[PDB]
């Protein structure tokens, strides 16, 4: 029991590490040997105002960092972390090794902090707290729930660490500490109380980012790996000083000897990164604004974002009544995506987003379906309300600082992500429409056996989607895996019947135009697809992946878009006393005795038969429960009226008929000029991709 | 504080009333003047183990009740609670003023006691607990959570009130005491945490009637009013040894002068319960099985419940393994009607259940559209299920002790209340195929604007249906009340425009065949009820409240059963330390200093790294939300099967337009015949009950 003293008011700690570090570390100055702890009670945005400090600040000369890190955790196992941790350690050696450089040489470590912000101490796993523990990050006993009455909201581990992580099994991680290896400034908080993950970024950048003022603050999620040189490549990026943020390239990790290449659903998942990092962003990246991917790590220069941009993304809109409004009350839902829009359309500077190829990150993707729904429900959310706020807000492009010709481009790219956003809301009805035109046409034409299985595909099709709806509103996709994995089996044979029936009608026509032209499209964006995948340099994905993203591509329609749009908002709707009584069963009462105060209590109950919107939280839930439901209702509806122009549904084929009689046909013309005008669309955003992704590769090239 | 003592080891109170109420009691013995409060530490099956009692056993000669009244509170305020109350005050006068009786008389009050049994304290209204205290039957402050180490589950407080209720404003109630005022003998139970209603029963039943030994037990709901005779003429139903149990008429409260009558939603449920007891409940009670009504109040005698009835109201199919069974788990949603079942089909037992039209009880009735729902998913979910376990277990029949004409009467009308059961599951495809078949033909008919009127009340039918689903399954009728009246008044006028084209094509004709049989089959059905309704001697409501019932029964098929199908279930899915310091900002602390326990703590971190279904409440959710989406999906699939075969929809007419191609029509001959076998079907159950009513009142005249 030793006496205290509050620095300035609050609690700043320094203990010592255990003996063991040492053995290591010999083979001394104070950061190394010691470990500080502080309790933060404010705000984030008000740390430097209370006199809360980091140990950057305080040497002799005051250290400049570069580049701030910032890892976020929630619930991660320690193999992820140390994933992460170990490309952050294998890239800090890389720049520290750098020979022929004005910024990064042997001390190059001092610039760069570590900072695993883990939300909430009951959600951190044990075996991550001694991961961090083996580093010398962290040690319990001195984390406090209240200081002079207030409550602690965060705890702050400080400490410069000289052992590297070589090697991480499935089961092991390997630490060791040498001559070879590089300190690690690392800086280990731990939210007290779990909010969300803009709360962790709230802390990063309105917090400690105010302090240290790096210069550029890159964004990982914990399980992450980072390639050897992904971080020196995306810093190198910012050497031109218009560049506000920047990308590089997500990969999925294929495992040992690409062994979880034999899932389908990981197969899928490997070809969709592929051409969504080929087609995608270097199309975007042409214009001057990405949507970053969601796992793709990815850094912003700080002076860019300050103002603004944070303000928007951590509040939102700040004028707001007392009522909620669309977008103010719904851009929680495109968390990052504002970010990079209001980097863009910052006004009076002329910050572009570029996207890096030569850096890339590659990380673990689901491989069972309910956990593959429950991520897609986030990602297909934000994507769709962001870019209905980047369509619905373009005009700030034209009161940013870019030049008219940036400001043109700017304004086709919003144009054109906003005709994608489009394409992929009626995905519902060009899915069944092409399907039932396909199987009934080639039952209408041979006959053989196409009249049953046209009947079949379209009961079993009809079954699977109405529950699916049904399953998505009511249940959980933890409870139902056998029918998920049912529907997803059937509808691949379904994509395998209506390829097999495109084949034949080809085949028979040629030995009529419309499937000229349904195969002079198809091997089209297949090729287009194909020679973008070379120019890139990647075409191994066009062989080892192609079929089972064929495959699983209704699912991706059919399952993860009901889902994710029935579930936009993830709703969730005195003392008396006591008696202890003695041996003899006796004891002692406070009892209302005089006749004088029961008289009272009776007129107090006598009084109370003469003188004859709940709580904010479930005001905003009902808000949330109608917009959700709001939008599946008008998602269902203008599909359906789509497929009712094209099928004749809805009785309306019954209402030309009768029509006529005033004065049903089996398919119509309208159904081969929808036929037509999808694989026209499908062909040409293929062909304006490869357009794009080639004007990349020269323009990097060059 | 003054020394008390445990009577018998738990804590009995006896404290005196105020001196208000000797001055109305003298214009005396012992149970005026004192009320005794108990607390209840055991289980309801526990009591008289336990060692605790009633006031009525502990006289000189102990009091034999022939009676006892339950009535059950969750928070019902004083108006609802002092109308019971008062309705079963004035009927007990009646009995005490009864003069040539062998079991009522001027000391008739002695065999009856009042068990109001209240949900929880901290769900209980407070004008309730001041109607309950001036009555004299409550006093606060003596209330204990627990005694010797025992959570206190149920506080009884006991008093014999001479004041009674004369008067029931919209806001006062009237209490007088004179000579004319008959003693009721209150009996208050509390609970202390609000398990629901079946709780409630089994305190009663298992509880305090085990103490009493009543011989009739009768159940009644803070709010229905039993009628100036209704206990009185209940009660005389039992001198029939062989009567088990009895209920009587629920009639509508319609207010000051008929005025509620005005609320279409008022006079709708007038009229369907005025049918649902002329024809319903007369004809199940020829058979001699009775399923009685939610509001209604009914009695058991208590010889008969005792043992197996009891045993499957409370606990269910005690015979089950860890996981859950269909009957065994769903039970609950039937609550009540299993009592009924169990003691029809009690072994050896020859019990039946009566019908008694001489006793009524008047209850106020939803008038708003949320609330009306929400009242309907309890009634509606429960009569299905109930109606399918008793089919299911229908042979139970054969085994009681019933005579072999008994037995083949229940069997019958087992097999009928399945035929009425399976008729309305498939109302949903019903309504649909009778307003499409009809609208259809007229405008294939006459062609004139019945055209346009088809394809625009197909398409409001359309979207009400699926919004209807979509808010069901995910939104609170609370939130969209709008929305909800909009779409009865859609289906309002939907069944205005069918009316109309009913007699617009059987005028015509008379100026086919089917529009003659429609005519003929509703013609009949409409005057069998008028003829039923005059047999009671009850027909005012045939014209009061006619019309609004036919113009919302589509909002009974179409809002009420696809919101009770949607939520079957109700689904709902170390401390660290602190700080305080000095003045001089000086605190002190416990610290690990010793370098020893440092390294503890370290290698206690290390060995973590080297060493590498939840509870059963979310189980049974999960589980209740899988019986609860599987009913939907296969409510929904079997009434589309009935829609795609008669109207040739799901491209069944695609399907053989093509197969005869390989040697589609407006409308077929199986719309016809649907047409008329749905009409005949419901002449047919209109028959049938007029022959039941007719029964049972021929048998009670004479
Ligand atoms: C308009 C829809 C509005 C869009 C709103 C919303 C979009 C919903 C898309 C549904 C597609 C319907 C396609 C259609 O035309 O309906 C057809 C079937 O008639 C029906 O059965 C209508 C059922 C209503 C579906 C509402 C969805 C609710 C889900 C739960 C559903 C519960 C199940 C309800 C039934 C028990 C129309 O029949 P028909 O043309 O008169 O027959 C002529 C066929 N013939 C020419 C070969 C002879
Ligand atoms: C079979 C159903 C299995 C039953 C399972 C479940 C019962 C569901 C009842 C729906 C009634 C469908 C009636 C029907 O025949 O479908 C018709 C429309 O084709 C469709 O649009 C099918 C849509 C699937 C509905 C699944 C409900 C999910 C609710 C959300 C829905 C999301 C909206 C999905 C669309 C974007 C069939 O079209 P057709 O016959 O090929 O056209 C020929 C018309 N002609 C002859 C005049 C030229």
Redesign the interface.
């Known amino acids: 029991?030793?006496?205290?003293?509050?620095w300035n008011?609050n609690?700043v700690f320094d203990?010592?590490?255990?003996?063991?570090?040492l053995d290591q570390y010999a083979t001394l100055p104070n950061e190394f040997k010691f470990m500080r702890y502080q309790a933060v009670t404010c705000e984030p945005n008000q740390l430097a105002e209370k006199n809360f400090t980091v140990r950057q600040l305080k040497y002799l000369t005051p250290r400049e960092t570069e580049l701030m890190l910032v890892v976020t955790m929630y619930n991660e196992d320690?193999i992820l972390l140390g994933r992460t941790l170990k490309g952050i350690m294998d890239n800090v050696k890389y720049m520290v090794k750098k020979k022929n450089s004005s910024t990064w040489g042997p001390d190059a470590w001092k610039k760069i902090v570590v900072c695993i912000i883990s939300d909430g101490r009951s959600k951190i796993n044990?075996?991550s707290?001694?991961?961090l523990?083996?580093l010398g990050c962290?040690?319990?006993?001195?984390?406090?729930?209240?200081?002079?009455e207030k409550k602690v909201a965060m705890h702050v581990y400080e400490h410069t660490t000289m052992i590297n992580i070589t090697n991480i099994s499935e089961?092991?991680?390997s630490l060791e500490c040498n001559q070879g290896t590089v300190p690690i400034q690392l800086l280990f908080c731990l939210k007290e109380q779990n909010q969300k993950k803009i709360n962790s970024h709230r802390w990063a950048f309105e917090g400690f980012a105010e302090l240290l003022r790096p210069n550029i603050v890159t964004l990982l999620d914990a399980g992450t790996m980072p390639g050897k040189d992904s971080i020196y490549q995306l810093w190198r990026e910012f050497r031109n000083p218009n560049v506000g943020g920047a990308c590089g390239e997500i990969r999925t990790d294929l495992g040992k000897r690409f062994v979880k290449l034999l899932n389908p659903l990981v197969a899928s998942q490997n070809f969709e990164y592929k051409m969504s990092n080929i087609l995608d962003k270097t199309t975007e990246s042409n214009f001057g604004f990405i949507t970053v991917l969601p796992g793709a790590f990815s850094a912003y220069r700080f002076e860019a974002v300050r103002g603004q941009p944070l303000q928007k993304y951590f509040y939102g809109e700040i004028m707001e009544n007392e009522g909620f409004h669309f977008f103010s009350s719904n851009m929680y839902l495109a968390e990052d995506r504002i970010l990079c829009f209001e980097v863009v359309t910052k006004k009076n500077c002329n910050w572009i987003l570029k996207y890096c190829r030569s850096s890339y990150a590659s990380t673990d993707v689901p491989e069972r379906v309910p956990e593959f729904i429950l991520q897609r429900r986030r990602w297909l959310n934000g994507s769709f309300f962001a870019s209905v706020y980047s369509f619905c807000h373009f005009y700030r492009v034209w009161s940013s600082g870019h030049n008219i010709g940036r400001k043109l481009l700017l304004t086709v790219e919003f144009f054109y992500l906003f005709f994608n956003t489009l394409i992929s809301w009626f995905s519902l009805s060009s899915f069944f429409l092409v399907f039932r035109i396909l199987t009934?046409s080639i039952?209408?034409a041979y006959?053989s056996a196409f009249?049953?299985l046209?009947?079949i595909f379209?009961?079993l099709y009809?079954?699977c989607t109405?529950?699916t709806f049904?399953?998505s509103?009511?249940?959980?996709p933890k409870?139902?895996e056998k029918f998920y994995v049912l529907t997803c089996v059937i509808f691949a044979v379904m994509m395998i019947y209506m390829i097999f029936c495109s084949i034949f009608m080809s085949v028979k026509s040629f030995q009529t135009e419309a499937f000229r032209d349904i195969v002079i499209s198809l091997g089209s964006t297949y090729c287009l697809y194909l020679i973008s995948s070379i120019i890139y340099l990647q075409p191994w994905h066009m062989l080892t992946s192609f079929i089972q993203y064929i495959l699983l591509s209704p699912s991706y329609i059919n399952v993860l878009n009901i889902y994710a749009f029935?579930n936009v908002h993830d709703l969730s709707?005195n003392?008396?006393?006591?008696?202890?009584?003695t041996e003899?069963?006796?004891?002692?009462?406070?009892?209302?005795?005089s006749?004088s105060e029961?008289?009272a209590?009776?007129?107090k109950?006598?009084?109370?038969?003469?003188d004859?919107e709940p709580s904010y939280d479930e005001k905003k839930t009902?808000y949330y429960?109608?917009v959700?439901?709001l939008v599946?209702?008008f998602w269902?509806?203008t599909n359906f009226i789509i497929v009712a122009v094209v099928l004749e549904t809805?009785?309306?084929?019954?209402?030309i008929?009768?029509?006529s009689?005033?004065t049903?046909?089996?398919m119509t013309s309208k159904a081969s000029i929808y036929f037509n005008v999808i694989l026209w669309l499908v062909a040409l955003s293929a062909l304006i991709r490869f357009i794009g992704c080639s004007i990349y590769m020269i323009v990097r090239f060059f």
């Open positions: 029991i030793r006496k205290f003293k509050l008011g609690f203990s010592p590490i255990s003996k063991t570090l320690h044990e075996r707290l001694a991961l523990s083996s962290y040690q319990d006993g001195f984390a406090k729930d209240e200081i002079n089961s092991e991680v009934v039952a209408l006959h009249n049953v046209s009947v379209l009961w009809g079954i109405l529950s049904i399953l509103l009511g249940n959980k409870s139902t029935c709707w003392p008396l006393g006591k008696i202890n009584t003899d069963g006796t004891f002692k009462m406070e009892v209302l005795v006749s029961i008289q209590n009776y007129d109950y006598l009084k109370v038969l003469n004859f009902g429960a109608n959700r439901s599946i209702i269902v509806i809805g009785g309306i084929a019954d209402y008929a009768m029509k009689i005033s049903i046909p089996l």
